[PDB]
Amino acid sequence: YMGWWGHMGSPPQKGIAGYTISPFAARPFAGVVHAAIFNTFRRTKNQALFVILPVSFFYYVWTQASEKNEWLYTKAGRHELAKAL
Amino acid sequence: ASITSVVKTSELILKSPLLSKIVVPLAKTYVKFSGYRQLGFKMNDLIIEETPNMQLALRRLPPTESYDRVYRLIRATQFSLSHKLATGNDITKPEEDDHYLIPYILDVEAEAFEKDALDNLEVV
Amino acid sequence: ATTFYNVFVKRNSAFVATILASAFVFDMTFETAIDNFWDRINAGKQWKDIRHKY
Amino acid sequence: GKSTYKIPDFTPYLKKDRNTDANRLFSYFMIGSFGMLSAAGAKATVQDFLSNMSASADVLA
Amino acid sequence: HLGCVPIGEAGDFGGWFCPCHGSHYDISGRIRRGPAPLNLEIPEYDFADAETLVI
Amino acid sequence: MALRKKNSLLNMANSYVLDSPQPSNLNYFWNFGSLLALCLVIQLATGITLAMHYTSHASLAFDSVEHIMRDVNFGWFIRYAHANTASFFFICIYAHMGRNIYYGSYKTPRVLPWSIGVIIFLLLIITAFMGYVLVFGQMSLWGATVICNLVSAIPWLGEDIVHFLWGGFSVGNPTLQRFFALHYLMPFVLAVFALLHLIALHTAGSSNPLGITSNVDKLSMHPYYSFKDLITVFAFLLMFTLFVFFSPDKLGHPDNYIPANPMVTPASIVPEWYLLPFYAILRAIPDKLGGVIAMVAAILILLILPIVDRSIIRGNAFKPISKLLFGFFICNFLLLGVLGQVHIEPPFIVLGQICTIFYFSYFLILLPMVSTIENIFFYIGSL
Amino acid sequence: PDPAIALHEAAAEGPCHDFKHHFDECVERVTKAQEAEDYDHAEYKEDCVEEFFHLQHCINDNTADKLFRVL
Amino acid sequence: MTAAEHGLHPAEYPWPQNGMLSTFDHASLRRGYQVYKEVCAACHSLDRIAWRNLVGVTHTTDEAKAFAEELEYDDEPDDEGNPRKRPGKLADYIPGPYPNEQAARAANQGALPPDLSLIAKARHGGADYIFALLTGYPDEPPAGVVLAPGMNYNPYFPGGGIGMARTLFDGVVEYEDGTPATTSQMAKDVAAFLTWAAEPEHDERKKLGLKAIIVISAMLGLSVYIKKFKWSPIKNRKFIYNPP
Numbered sequence A: 001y002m003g004w005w006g007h008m009g010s011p012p013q014k015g016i017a018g019y020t021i022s023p024f025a026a027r028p029f030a031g032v033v034h035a036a037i038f039n040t041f042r043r044t045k046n047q048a049l050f051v052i053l054p055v056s057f058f059y060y061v062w063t064q065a066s067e068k069n070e071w072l073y074t075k076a077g078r079h080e081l082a083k084a085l
Numbered sequence B: 001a002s003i004t005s006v007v008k009t010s011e012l013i014l015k016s017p018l019l020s021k022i023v024v025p026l027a028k029t030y031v032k033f034s035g036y037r038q039l040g041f042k043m044n045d046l047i048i049e050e051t052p053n054m055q056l057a058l059r060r061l062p063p064t065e066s067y068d069r070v071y072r073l074i075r076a077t078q079f080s081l082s083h084k085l086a087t088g089n090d091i092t093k094p095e096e097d098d099h100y101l102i103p104y105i106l107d108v109e110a111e112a113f114e115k116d117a118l119d120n121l122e123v124v
Numbered sequence C: 001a002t003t004f005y006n007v008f009v010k011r012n013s014a015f016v017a018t019i020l021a022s023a024f025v026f027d028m029t030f031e032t033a034i035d036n037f038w039d040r041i042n043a044g045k046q047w048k049d050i051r052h053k054y
Numbered sequence D: 001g002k003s004t005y006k007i008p009d010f011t012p013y014l015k016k017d018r019n020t021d022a023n024r025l026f027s028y029f030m031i032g033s034f035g036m037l038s039a040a041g042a043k044a045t046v047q048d049f050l051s052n053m054s055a056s057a058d059v060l061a
Numbered sequence E: 001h002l003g004c005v006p007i008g009e010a011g012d013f014g015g016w017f018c019p020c021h022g023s024h025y026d027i028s029g030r031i032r033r034g035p036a037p038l039n040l041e042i043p044e045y046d047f048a049d050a051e052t053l054v055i
Numbered sequence F: 001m002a003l004r005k006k007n008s009l010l011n012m013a014n015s016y017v018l019d020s021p022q023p024s025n026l027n028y029f030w031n032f033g034s035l036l037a038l039c040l041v042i043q044l045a046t047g048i049t050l051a052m053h054y055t056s057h058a059s060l061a062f063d064s065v066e067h068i069m070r071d072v073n074f075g076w077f078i079r080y081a082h083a084n085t086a087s088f089f090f091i092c093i094y095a096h097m098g099r100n101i102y103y104g105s106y107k108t109p110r111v112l113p114w115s116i117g118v119i120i121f122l123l124l125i126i127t128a129f130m131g132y133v134l135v136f137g138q139m140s141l142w143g144a145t146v147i148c149n150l151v152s153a154i155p156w157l158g159e160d161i162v163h164f165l166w167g168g169f170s171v172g173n174p175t176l177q178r179f180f181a182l183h184y185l186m187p188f189v190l191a192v193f194a195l196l197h198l199i200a201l202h203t204a205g206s207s208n209p210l211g212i213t214s215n216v217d218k219l220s221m222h223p224y225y226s227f228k229d230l231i232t233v234f235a236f237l238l239m240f241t242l243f244v245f246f247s248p249d250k251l252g253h254p255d256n257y258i259p260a261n262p263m264v265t266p267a268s269i270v271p272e273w274y275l276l277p278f279y280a281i282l283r284a285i286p287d288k289l290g291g292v293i294a295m296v297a298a299i300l301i302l303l304i305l306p307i308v309d310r311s312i313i314r315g316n317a318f319k320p321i322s323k324l325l326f327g328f329f330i331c332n333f334l335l336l337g338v339l340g341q342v343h344i345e346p347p348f349i350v351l352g353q354i355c356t357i358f359y360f361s362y363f364l365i366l367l368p369m370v371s372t373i374e375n376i377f378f379y380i381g382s383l
Numbered sequence G: 001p002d003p004a005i006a007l008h009e010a011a012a013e014g015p016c017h018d019f020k021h022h023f024d025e026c027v028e029r030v031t032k033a034q035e036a037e038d039y040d041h042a043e044y045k046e047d048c049v050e051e052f053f054h055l056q057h058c059i060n061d062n063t064a065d066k067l068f069r070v071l
Numbered sequence H: 001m002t003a004a005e006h007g008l009h010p011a012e013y014p015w016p017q018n019g020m021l022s023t024f025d026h027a028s029l030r031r032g033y034q035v036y037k038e039v040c041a042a043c044h045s046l047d048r049i050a051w052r053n054l055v056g057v058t059h060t061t062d063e064a065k066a067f068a069e070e071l072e073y074d075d076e077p078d079d080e081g082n083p084r085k086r087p088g089k090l091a092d093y094i095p096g097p098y099p100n101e102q103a104a105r106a107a108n109q110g111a112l113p114p115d116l117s118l119i120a121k122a123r124h125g126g127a128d129y130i131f132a133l134l135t136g137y138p139d140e141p142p143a144g145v146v147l148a149p150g151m152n153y154n155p156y157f158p159g160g161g162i163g164m165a166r167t168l169f170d171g172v173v174e175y176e177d178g179t180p181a182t183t184s185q186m187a188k189d190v191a192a193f194l195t196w197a198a199e200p201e202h203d204e205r206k207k208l209g210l211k212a213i214i215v216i217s218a219m220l221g222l223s224v225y226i227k228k229f230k231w232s233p234i235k236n237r238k239f240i241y242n243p244p
């Protein structure tokens, strides 16, 4: 499923003209400030839910579990601990 | 899963009035959130092609459809590496998201599956 | 800039010689610089600072 | 859009002084600095690391 | 409990007393009082003779 | 013809590091492969150097490690580098595996590199476990004891196998000397399998974040990915430097600075952090043999991803529901890690069981269902 | 004398007063309970370790930096 | 687990050596050695430290040779193969108070005082735990705690009952540099000294780390410029498509 240079396995290409300029002719950091602020904000905003929802859910579960565990091993939690074991 | 499977199940749903009433709106939002149109892809450009059946279907595409697919893949790759999205006419509009490849793969698979059946025939 | 390019950069043999000689200088001077800076931020704490009492 | 002799717009990226020696020299200064720190870092790494094989403090004692 | 060696004949069940966290073993060397969870482990031993055991 | 192409030896290197055609759109998550190669090189260099100063005999092992710390020139660095790079190796391998799962790298035609990859991961676990024993501190001994006793669960022969592994009736000198020999060996085996999975991959080439073919648009590995790999190499070396020079013991257990004592049992015996999720899965099943099977199954189940993923599309970039499920799967795997090092107490016992069910149901139920439904939504939604 | 003594006393009377009073009340209860007979044959014997920990943790928070400043 | 079973967690004290760029205070190390020698060394060994280790850290070559030369060490047998003693050398390890574990336990009501050479790394808390433990013996155990005989209440020790009694009291040591030897001061000095004993490379390690951080950061910045420079023809590429 992959060939090599000259016979890579692409369907025939026709009609595409590609253009580019030399690394010495270009400013490598052109538009960096716009990218760093606006591009990163867009990319991050669009993926935020997929991180926030699972992280926040599992952090909540952990927080509840660790707080209960802590309370069961106090004096106040003696009776509830006795039942739990 | 085979394209045949996907197409048949989809047709069962589209038949049922109740089912279509609840599934079609979900499917449309799914496609909007999927975001492949924002890289100028058509849905069928995403189908896995590294299989004998798919290689055969792609070889049967008309030359123009095949040249246009190559350009969409190259253009999408350039958006991906640049971390940009399509703008303007590069965005695939819902009316342009045509199933150009589905009929070819369904024919290839029809033969492949008939061959499997007939390889197991028992003279009665 | 032409002159500098022609002498130190154009021939890779010269470019590599310049890089290696610079690395030698960097290494020696950086060592001395960090040693002094380290001694100033940690003044009165190190053995060298209390050694004179003994 | 159609003519392939109309080069796409590269003005947002093109440097005006692109053919000058100063232009090349700057990029080679960055490459050279990187090669220089890599050489000094390699030397430090090799020297400190290989010194493990020289007589240890208990042996020198 | 944790693995100190109990001082024998001492205790409160007059068998063995671990001084570490104050766990009391019996004359069977069974745990009676203190943090220790189990009775003092028995090795695999056999009486080859009536006068010699092998462990 | 260029020499790099004509000469058969040069041509093999050329095919993998120079002319190798890559997709032009690999993102930074494609950099973990070269970071793993870097960890492997650091472990070989530091490990062989430690072997020149370490003594595998149980009477001298712990003290030989103290001699390395105290007397050998730069011994402290070599030891801390080796111990911290073991943790970095696992961070990179989990990242690399997470990349592979998110982007569908296990799908045809890459089932073979993925399957060999699962074995690489098993070899890394064994290598790291044996290396940890070599210190012969308290965690070394008690970790060896608890983990090696899981083999006693094998029916009929289990006890015999344990005594055979230990070379005696408990973890002691014979065990330590054999672990040293195998710990030295296993990284070489691991390097061979790492090479095998790359040769297997070379038939299809790298996948890419869009999940489509890159045969239309290839870039040479060098110079593009050589220079992109340097960025993450230097980022890695910055993290390495912060741990090795400023906090060398943050990832370790203080009990491993107490010499092994078969009498005193440590308060809590836990594996190194990177094994903690598998330990939580083992605890979840009450049966001894059940727990061992579940724990091994947790790794071997990765082999069925090629089958249970029913999607017609490779990878998750365009699959919102799959992306949500993957996020929950990953966070669950981290929670299992945390539960691996809590005490066996309420309510963490039941939570560990629920998280274990979620872990397995991802492979057996959720991924097959979600991937089926997304197929239908893509088809209907684009009609 | 030991600077810690003064700092600890000041922190107990000041920022850690609630915890000081909790510990005190606990001590009073436990001592009284020990005074009562058939205490030795009781199921649950209360201690004041918890309250002590809350107080000491508080004193340490308010003292650690001050103490090391005068050494 | 109960908090008592864990032990109270020690405060974070601002040690001189806390701080990416900070060494130990060597004057405190020297004072801490004097606390070790006059108080702790009665029950605790420091077996991983040789006399040469003190030199140029806490003591001069001559001071450390003098400490070594006051002791007797086992020599090689004489010509009839009879045992002999010799005076100590810089290469010798600091000798411990007891000949074996059994003797150590017999002198400490069954408890074995640990060797202190790695204790700062072998306990959660490090210097803070040592300082908290030494200064954290309350005059009276919290009401209701029953101590086993020969146990002392200390909240920082897990379980609360430690076999080591309080040992630091105002003026048990007379420091040679005129520093007032309060309980707190002695605990701070000896905790610093023990930290040094656990990790004697500390000062050098952090300075080499500073050099590494600087070089690696520069290399990272340059590698970003070089990557962007090399990639710009790919990033800047443009297409015109005329469908055939």
Ligand code: HEC
Residues within 6 Å of the ligand: H035, H036, H039, H040, H042, H043, H044, H108, H111, H112, H113, H114, H119, H123, H130, H133, H134, H157, H161, H162, H163, H164, H165, H167, H190
């Ligand atoms: C005369 C006896 C004695 C003196 C003096 C003594 N110790 Fe100890 N120490 C012990 C004993 C016994 C233990 C073991 C206590 C136990 O495990 O219950 C111990 C334990 C310790 C521990 C470990 C506690 C733990 O977490 O296991 C440290 C740290 C310690 N001592 C430091 C010191 C320092 C520092 C000094 C004096 C500056 C000191 N000791 C003086 C007898 C002593």
Ligand code: HEM
Residues within 6 Å of the ligand: F040, F043, F044, F046, F047, F048, F049, F050, F051, F054, F065, F079, F082, F083, F086, F089, F124, F127, F128, F129, F131, F132, F133, F134, F135, F183, F184, F187, F190
């Ligand atoms: C994948 C490669 C490797 C991994 C993941 C690995 C992992 C480990 C780990 C986790 C330890 C315990 C470290 C500690 O806490 O002190 C260790 C110790 C050790 N390893 Fe390795 N190792 C690897 C390769 C090697 C190799 C190739 C050697 C060659 C002999 C080696 C020799 C040692 C030695 C001698 C020790 C004990 C001394 C010490 O603890 O530092 N290792 N290894």
Ligand code: HEM
Residues within 6 Å of the ligand: F029, F030, F031, F032, F033, F034, F036, F037, F040, F093, F096, F097, F100, F105, F106, F110, F113, F114, F116, F117, F118, F120, F121, F190, F194, F197, F198, F201, F205, F206, F207, F208
């Ligand atoms: C020593 C450990 C390993 C090393 C050095 C290593 C190295 C690499 C390298 C260099 C690549 C090509 C570049 C990249 O995609 O990052 C790669 C690709 C791959 N590796 Fe690994 N690998 C290791 C372990 C694993 C493991 C544990 C797995 C799977 C469980 C795995 C599965 C793969 C797969 C499927 C690919 C192809 C990914 C793709 O390009 O789409 N590898 N590996």
Ligand SMILES: CCCCCCCCCCCCO[C@@H]1O[C@H](CO)[C@@H](O[C@H]2O[C@H](CO)[C@@H](O)[C@H](O)[C@H]2O)[C@H](O)[C@H]1O
Residues within 6 Å of the ligand: D046, D047, D048, D049, D050, D051, H204, H208
């Ligand atoms: C192909 C490569 C060629 C051969 C490689 C050379 C192998 C070993 C040579 C030098 C190793 C020992 O060389 C020695 O290194 C250590 C640092 O590592 C230096 O020591 C210097 O820094 C160290 C810590 O970084 C300090 O403890 C020391 O007080 C200071 O003098 C010595 O100044 C140098 O004399």
Ligand SMILES: CCCCCCCCCCCCO[C@@H]1O[C@H](CO)[C@@H](O[C@H]2O[C@H](CO)[C@@H](O)[C@H](O)[C@H]2O)[C@H](O)[C@H]1O
Residues within 6 Å of the ligand: A003, A004, F005, F008, F011, F012, F013, F014, F015, F016, F017, F019, F199, F202
């Ligand atoms: C990664 C470190 C670098 C060392 C190289 C790794 C060692 C593994 C190499 C041995 C495995 C055999 O590797 C195999 O070699 C041949 C030529 O070399 C490659 O062949 C490829 O390149 C050559 C020209 O470059 C073409 O003739 C051929 O059409 C193409 O498929 C195979 O795609 C590769 O699978």
Ligand code: FES
Residues within 6 Å of the ligand: E001, E002, E003, E004, E018, E019, E020, E021, E022, E023, E034, E035, E036
């Ligand atoms: S160690 Fe025996 S009672 Fe805790």
